[PDB]
Design a protein around this nucleic acid. Structure first.
Ligand code: AMP
Length: 627
DNA sequence: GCTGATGCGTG
DNA sequence: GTCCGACCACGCATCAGC
């Protein structure tokens, strides 16, 4: 009976405590019940142990189902480079829920909005189908993803409808949450990998049934078992960091075990790697304190796309994003300039660059906003209007050899010798090797004058290995980063923990000339759970049927609930930006723009102030001009 | 072909 | 103070209904 499956129990037996038989398909109810127990407890150690217990049972009884269970737990359809997209959100899902239940769409939409979760609407509104299996549900997910073109939505909903029909207990709750993209399991790539290494360590794969070894850490002490499990997890995470492909890792892991996995999987071009990231710093003094005496280089903080350029032995080139998505079609201009950025001796590499929009007429750098207007579909180079300049700063791979273990001085050296620069097309990142504080400060202000967001600071020899998929403390960011009183003119219904309350708010400034409230930004950060739920009734009493005549929101998202302009909030923001969406001070700085708040954050309520005493739109334009 | 609703990516 | 999972804003992209 899969409805009683308790993978959170102590002394879990991968065979006797499982809700299915050997050689039999893993039921999806076992996965859903694993999701329930993971969410009921808060200790992330117990959430990993509960997921491992399911994986141990999968490994022991139904090994071919390990890959679908992992992807279902990660809410992914496959390898990130494959580019498989469901094309399903809340809109298609509620249409399927209303169609399966025979209810109207607005009644289902009203319920989904009030309860805040679409999975609760599908579960409660339940409307003889065989029991769902893990690989069966996963195959239906990939089937929904393959449907494209005209009249594909109805075909997607039909697959979803048949799923909701076969759903029992909490299966519909987690299928709807997964299809909406918000599974909210509490575990992701780090925790799912942790549970997998624990599973194959406790219940080794490749055994004859019945498995003679079910708890390999039985006689170990608590510390010894913890130490042995921590190092086994480091083997899997180190191998997966270099080969982030579950389609490749899992088959070899099941056949040769975890300890022999590094001998079969090696870093090579063609498989995208999660790039190295940096930690923010609050100033140059913190940089030198954290770096102690380690020599560092100062690099420009570029405002573009992190592009991983893979050149395969033979001549094939692929461009990958930071999220391991293939962008080779988005950049045909970069593909055509590959032969003129390297020496003839270069036959294979993995480049770590920054794709920055380039004004070829002015020989200047354009902001990231101009880069986002680039077509992302299959473009041809002749129609590219926003050219890009490549800014390389690291070399992961060169001519069959990996350089992740070499220091940055060795990697930067091999990058400057084997690659040739072309102005406005491919150049090395503007760097400066120095220890003088005054020289770093001038380099930083220079960086801003060249339309960059600051400085990247990286160690050169001490702790200077390329750390894949890691936000390192050996890379530091020297970035450039106002209090305003805005009127709450609308509310947005919340999800997740804010399901039954408000999750966002539409703020507005006061325009003195037209005597109108102009929307300026959206706000949902800076709130404690207490001051949100304890004050949600105060804003709920301000709900208006229709917006006031003096409220102007223009192209901003229409709020779910219009609120009577009466609440004035003190809001802090990193900086101000020109927005083609918000109408606040539209014609006071630019002719057809307006000013919004970048990363706003709630501070306090200003009950002493009234909407007409809020920060004026002229005051907003003055703050932007002072930037 | 147009429009509005809808989905997706990444810094 | 560090790690981790979840979220997002604004751009392009996709599609239902006409
Ligand atoms: P900011 O907090 O906006 O983050 C900047 C991101 O861009 C990457 N990046 C820009 N420029 C470089 C260089 N020269 N070297 C390495 N990384 C760079 C950062 O890693 C951040 O992801």
């Amino acid at each position: 009976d899969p409805s009683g499956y308790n993978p959170a129990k102590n002394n879990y037996h991968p065979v006797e405590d499982a809700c299915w038989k050997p050689g039999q398909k893993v039921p999806y109810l076992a996965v859903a019940r694993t999701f329930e127990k993971i969410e009921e407890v808060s200790a992330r150690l117990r959430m990993v142990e509960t997921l491992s217990n399911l994986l141990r049972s999968v490994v022991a009884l139904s090994p071919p189902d390990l890959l679908p269970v992992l992807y279902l737990s990660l809410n992914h359809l496959g390898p990130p480079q494959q580019g498989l997209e469901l094309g399903v959100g809340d809109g298609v899902l509620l249409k399927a829920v209303a169609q399966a239940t025979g209810r109207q769409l607005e009644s289902v939409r009203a319920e989904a909005a009030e309860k805040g979760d679409v999975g609760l609407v599908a579960e409660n509104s339940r409307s003889p189908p065989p029991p769902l299996t893990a690989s069966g549900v996963f195959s239906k997910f990939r089937d929904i993803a393959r449907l494209t073109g005209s009249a594909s939505t109805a075909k997607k909903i039909d697959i979803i409808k048949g799923l909701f029909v076969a759903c029992r207990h909490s299966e519909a709750r987690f299928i709807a949450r997964s299809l909406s993209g918000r599974l909210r399991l509490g575990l992701a790539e780090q925790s799912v990998l942790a549970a997998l290494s624990q599973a194959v360590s406790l219940t080794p794969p490749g055994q004859e049934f019945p498995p003679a070894m079910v708890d390999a850490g039985k006689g170990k002490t608590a510390e010894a078992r913890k130490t042995w499990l921590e190092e086994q997890g480091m083997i899997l995470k180190q191998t997966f960091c270099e080969v982030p492909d579950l389609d490749r890792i899992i088959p070899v892991l099941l056949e040769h075990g975890l300890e022999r996995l590094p001998e079969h999987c090696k870093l090579s071009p063609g498989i995208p790697l999660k790039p190295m990231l940096a930690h923010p710093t609050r100033g140059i003094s913190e940089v030198l304190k954290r770096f102690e005496e380690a020599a560092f280089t100062c690099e420009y903080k570029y405002d573009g796309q992190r592009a991983q350029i893979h050149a395969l032995e033979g001549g094939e080139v692929k461009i990958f994003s930071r999220n391991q998505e293939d962008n080779t079609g988005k950049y045909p201009d970069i593909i055509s300039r590959i032969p003129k950025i390297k020496l003839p001796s270069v036959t294979s590499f993995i480049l770590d660059t920054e794709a920055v929009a380039w004004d070829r007429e002015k020989k200047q750098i354009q902001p990231f906003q101009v880069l986002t207007t680039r077509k992302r579909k299959e473009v041809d180079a002749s129609e590219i209007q926003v050219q890009v300049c490549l800014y390389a700063f690291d070399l992961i791979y060169l001519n069959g050899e990996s350089l992740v273990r070499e220091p940055l001085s060795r990697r930067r050296q091999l990058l400057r010798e084997n690659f040739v620069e072309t102005e406005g097309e491919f150049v090395f990142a503007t760097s400066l090797d120095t220890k003088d504080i005054e020289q770093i400060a001038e380099f930083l202000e220079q960086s801003v004058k060249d339309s960059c967001e600051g400085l990247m600071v990286k160690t050169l020899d001490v702790d200077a290995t390329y750390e894949i998929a890691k936000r390192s403390h050996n890379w530091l960011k020297l970035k450039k980063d106002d209090t305003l009183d805005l009127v709450v003119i609308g509310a947005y219904l919340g999800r997740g923990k804010r399901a039954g309350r408000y999750g966002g708010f539409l703020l507005a400034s006061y325009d003195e000339d037209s005597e109108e409230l102009q929307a300026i930004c959206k706000l949902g950060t800076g709130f404690s759970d207490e001051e949100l739920e304890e004050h949600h009734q105060s804003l709920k009493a301000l709900v208006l049927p229709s917006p006031r005549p003096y409220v102007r929101i223009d192209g901003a998202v229409i709020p779910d609930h219009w609120l009577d302009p009466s609440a004035v909030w003190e809001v802090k923001c990193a900086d101000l930006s020109l927005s083609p969406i918000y109408p606040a001070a539209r014609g006071l700085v630019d002719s057809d723009k307006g000013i919004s708040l970048r990363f706003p954050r709630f501070i306090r309520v200003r009950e002493d102030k009234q909407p007409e005493q809020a920060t004026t739109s002229a005051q907003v334009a003055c703050l932007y001009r002072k930037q």
